[PDB]
Amino acid sequence: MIRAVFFDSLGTLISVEGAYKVHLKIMEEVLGDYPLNPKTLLDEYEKLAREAFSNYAGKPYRPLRDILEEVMRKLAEKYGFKYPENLWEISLRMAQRYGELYPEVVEVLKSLKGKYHVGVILNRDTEPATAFLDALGIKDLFDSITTSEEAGFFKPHPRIFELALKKAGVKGEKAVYVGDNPVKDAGGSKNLGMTSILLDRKGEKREFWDKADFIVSDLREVIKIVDELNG
Ligand SMILES: [Mg+2]
Ligand SMILES: [Mg+2]
């Protein structure tokens, strides 16, 4: 029986397009009048952050603030603009102003509440991530919020999923995990016995669909999967 449904954040609850806008607005603020295209700075940021962060996948937790500050330091040195003071605060303000949920999120979360444990798992620092969920208006819709800072390891290390399950009080066999990353989300959660749902909104990850138990393009399909699993 499925008693718990856990959600990834970025690309699952939190819009990738909204995240791009957030990040572009950060770059615009950082640069000011510096004669660099903010979109080009953003493109370079995304490359470095992907690589720097891929080195931490499954590894012991390190504050993401520190990792991203080091990326920005490299970018400032590369392009010649002054390293921005209070970068973290700029980023938090931009995320609260421009971050966006996918349109079905509130409905889906509310539909599961009262029948299942509703959880979110964030590969992030706890205070900023929780304040962002609060700004988007959904912090209190969750029975549990679990983070890499709490578990001590980044996805797909099993500890973050183990902790989420403990908060819900069930073993993995009783839970579903929905995420958009085949290896870090589907593979990671399967390692604890969870039922993995790969969210492929644009149908662009077919070559990785066999890494998950179910594939969906819209979070409204999740409750139908859970209902069927429960008879
Ligand atoms: Mg994601
Ligand atoms: Mg995350």
Residue numbers in the entry: 1 to 231
Quote what the paper states about this structure.
MBH reactions are valuable carbon-carbon bond forming transformations in organic synthesis, for which no natural enzymes are known. Previous work has afforded the MBHase BH32.1413 which promotes catalysis via a histidine nucleophile. In this work, His23 is replaced by Nδ-methylhistidine (MeHis) for the creation of a more efficient MBHase. In this study, we explore the evolutionary trajectory of a BH32 variant with MeHis in place of His23.
To identify a suitable starting template for engineering a MeHis-containing MBHase, we replaced the His23 nucleophile of BH32 and selected evolved descendants with MeHis using an engineered pyrrolysyl-tRNA synthetase/tRNA pair. In contrast to the improved hydrolytic activity observed upon His23MeHis substitution in BH3220, MBH activity was reduced upon MeHis incorporation across all BH32 variants. Of the modified variants tested, BH32.8 His23MeHis (subsequently referred to as BHMeHis1.0) was found to have the highest activity and was selected for further engineering. BHMeHis1.0 was also found to have an altered pH optimum compared to BH32.8, with the highest conversion observed at pH 6.0. To gain insights into this mechanism, crystal structures of apo-BHMeHis1.0 and apo-BHMeHis1.8 were solved. Efforts to obtain structures complexed with either substrate(s) or product have thus far been unsuccessful. Comparison of the BHMeHis1.8 and BHMeHis1.0 structures reveals that the 23 mutations installed during evolution cause minimal changes to the overall protein fold (secondary structure root mean square deviation (rmsd) 0.47 Å, Supplementary Fig. 9). The MeHis nucleophile adopts a single conformation in the structures of BHMeHis1.8 and BHMeHis1.0, however a notable 120° rotation of the imidazole ring has occurred. The first four mutations introduced into BHMeHis1.0 during rounds 1 and 2 of evolution gave a > 4-fold increase in activity. In contrast, these mutations reduce activity in the analogous His23 containing variant (BH32.8), and therefore would not have been selected if evolving with His23 as the catalytic nucleophile.
